[PDB]
């Protein structure tokens, strides 16, 4: 993304120097043919994208495209038309909110019902309407945006749903942010921790625990990919299981290390013992031999030569033994030095202290927040399967509130709010969607359409007994995917005060939980809003449990933790408080998808696959597909995100248009 044309390819999540699978399908003549024609194709594509991206507030037409192409790229008018049409159809250009050069024809082809007015639903609806289809969105809630929900009272603004743009580098919300007035503000990465008591973690310790966390994660990846530790007792290995195992092996090594150290101390002590014994025996033989010499020397001259020899021989023998003992006394000295050195440099007493395991649990809580699930549920092998598609650049927050995006997308769309879909019927001839008014449930509605786009959250599709009945029932391959896949939970506590008592230069600050069981409970506080608002996350096992506890108690536990960090005099009572309960929300049944143990990226593709009904009269030709699926749980490469939802909508609009208007 250094060049201008190459930068557009990157911003559109396309390889600038190669044709994609989708391109091979729509341009088989080109990709199967000479290299020169492919390079021409790739430039026309890359350039068209550049033009759209440079000004995404107005429709890029085919004519406007052909104008600004230099030869020999503008030579082939049909190739330029095919490229433009492909890009428009698949929502790579002329997506979001742009001024249209030519008004849409009042004559509409085909009828589509879209279930849900979330970003996936709205993204699809806009595309389909702009392709000249008749679109109606059915929405259970009294509002649009779905899991994008912004709280508003006076000047107070706080997202209870999606909050963060995870970088603009390759992000389609980059285009939407130019089209819609979003106040995008960078998140300052500095995040001080504060232990149970309210004391900031010592800098050196903080750095040590964090480094151990990242090593523990990398270890699970090694455990997974290198040692192939992915099944245990005919059950898929959790990330939690792998972390437990990796920790236990680190605790084992600490003990194994101590043993080897003490084992070489006893081996030196048993050398010293064997020496000291030899020196004690030799001292007795020296003592005895000295007496014998003393007695022989006491015999005064004159004496015969045998008496002289006895004095001399004993003197010789005593000097020889006094040499041995002095050599052993040296050997004793160096073994005593070695022993004092081993006692001075012992190995680690413990792998992790009680406080270190507590601070480490915060990093696990952070990971449980990110995946919106207990680490015991995450697939070790595939929890991070979308890593290669992550965007580049600083993460940003929406200061004016994320709702600004769906509300903007909803302009000019036929949206039935307070309309809860109960039954989806799909046959060879078409579809009936049976909904009710959420207020008076007896007021029944029937919508007849050529196609149904289902953007129901995975939480709703999972609900047993079902909130929505499919007739005929969804195939085993679809329902198995729904059952297998993870749908997580993550809650937010909005605290609105009259004055700022926290560090305005710090956007993020954590609280370390007392125990492992409570590590997710109000583990993080967010300060990214203009007004004095603090947003507390409830992650991990804590999320599900804290939904069965009153807002007062939760606001209670919040103030307690803040008092601990800032002191009782600094923390006032909050003016306004909100507590999200996403698992209990019957139009969500959770926060967003995770790759559950026993699932993979492949299930996200199964979720995206449309249903084709059986024939009406039998021996009748294979019907066309009727029931289509979009939403964050349908996009393998960008799951559990707003950009994922948006991209999933654009994808299904193109698949539906291709089907019912022709490619």
């Amino acid at each position: 993304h250094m060049s201008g044309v190459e930068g557009a390819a990157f911003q559109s999540r396309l390889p600038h120097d190669r044709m994609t699978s989708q391109e091979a399908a729509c341009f088989p003549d080109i990709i199967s043919g000479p290299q020169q024609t492919q390079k021409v194709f790739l430039f026309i594509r890359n350039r068209t994208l550049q033009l759209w991206l440079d000004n995404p507030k107005i429709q890029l037409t085919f004519e406007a495209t052909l104008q600004q192409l230099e030869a020999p790229y503008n030579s082939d008018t049909v190739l330029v038309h095919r490229v433009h049409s492909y890009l428009e159809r698949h929502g790579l250009i002329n997506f979001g909110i742009y001024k249209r050069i030519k008004p849409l024809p009042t004559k509409k082809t085909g009828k589509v019902i879209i279930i849900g007015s979330g970003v996936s639903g709205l993204a699809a609806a806009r595309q389909l309407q702009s392709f000249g289809m008749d679109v109606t969105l059915l929405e259970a809630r009294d509002r649009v945006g779905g899991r994008v929900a912004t709280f508003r009272k006076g000047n107070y603004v706080a997202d209870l749903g999606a909050m963060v743009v995870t970088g603009l580098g390759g992000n389609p919300m980059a285009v939407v942010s130019k089209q819609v007035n979003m106040e995008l503000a960078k998140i300052k990465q500095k995040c001080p921790l504060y232990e149970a008591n309210g004391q900031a973690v010592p800098k050196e310790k903080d750095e040590m625990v964090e480094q151990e966390f990242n090593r523990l994660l990398e270890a699970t990846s090694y455990l997974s990919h290198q040692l192939d530790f992915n099944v245990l007792n005919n059950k898929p290995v959790s990330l939690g299981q792998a972390l437990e195992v990796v920790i236990q092996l680190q605790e084992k090594h600490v003990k194994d290390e101590q043993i080897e150290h003490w084992k070489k101390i006893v081996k030196t002590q048993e050398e010293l013992k064997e020496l000291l014994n030899k020196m004690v025996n030799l001292k007795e033989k020296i003592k005895e031999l000295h007496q014998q010499y003393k007695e022989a020397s006491e015999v005064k001259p004159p004496r015969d030569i045998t008496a002289e020899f006895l004095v001399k021989s004993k003197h010789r023998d005593l000097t020889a033994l006094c040499k041995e003992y002095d050599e052993l006394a040296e050997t004793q000295g160096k073994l005593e030095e070695k022993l004092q050195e081993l006692e001075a440099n012992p190995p680690s007493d413990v792998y992790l202290s009680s406080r270190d395991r507590q601070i480490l649990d915060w990093h696990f809580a952070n990971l449980e927040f990110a995946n919106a699930t207990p680490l015991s549920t995450l697939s070790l092998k595939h929890w991070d399967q979308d890593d290669d598609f992550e965007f580049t650049g600083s993460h940003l927050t929406v200061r004016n509130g994320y709702s600004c995006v769906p509300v903007a997308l909803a302009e000019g769309l036929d949206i039935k709010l307070n309309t809860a879909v109960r039954q989806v019927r799909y046959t060879a001839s078409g579809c009936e969607v049976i909904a009710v008014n959420t207020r008076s449930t007896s007021q029944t509605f029937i919508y007849k359409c050529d196609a149904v786009l289902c953007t129901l959250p995975l939480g709703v599709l999972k609900q047993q007994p079902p909130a929505v009945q499919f007739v005929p029932p969804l195939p085993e391959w679809k329902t198995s995917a729904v059952q297998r896949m993870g749908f997580g939970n993550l809650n937010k506590v909005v605290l609105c005060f009259d004055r700022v008592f926290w560090d305005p230069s710090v956007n993020l600050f954590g609280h370390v939980g007392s125990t492992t069981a409570s590590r997710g409970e109000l583990f993080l506080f967010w300060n990214l809003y203009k007004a004095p608002i603090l947003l507390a996350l409830v992650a991990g096992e804590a999320a599900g449990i804290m939904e069965n506890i009153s807002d007062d108690v939760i606001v209670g536990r919040c103030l307690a933790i803040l008092k601990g960090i800032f002191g009782s005099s600094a923390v006032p009572q909050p003016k306004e408080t909100v507590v999200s309960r996403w698992r209990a929300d019957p139009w969500a049944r959770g926060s967003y998808s995770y790759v559950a143990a026993g699932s993979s990226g492949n299930d996200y593709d199964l979720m995206a696959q449309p249903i084709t009904p059986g024939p009406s009269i039998p021996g009748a030709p294979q019907p066309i597909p009727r029931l289509f699926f979009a939403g964050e749980h349908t996009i393998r490469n960008y799951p559990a995100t707003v950009h994922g939802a948006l991209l999933s909508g654009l994808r299904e609009a193109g698949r539906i248009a291709d089907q019912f208007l022709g490619a």
């Binding site: 995040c191 964090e210 927040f369 990110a370 995946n371 993080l524 790759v595 995100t641």
Partner: peptide, 9 residues
């Protein structure tokens, strides 16, 4: 997913 992690290494 990983993307949402705070204090990313």
């Amino acid at each position: 997913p990983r993307s949402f992690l705070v204090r990313r290494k």
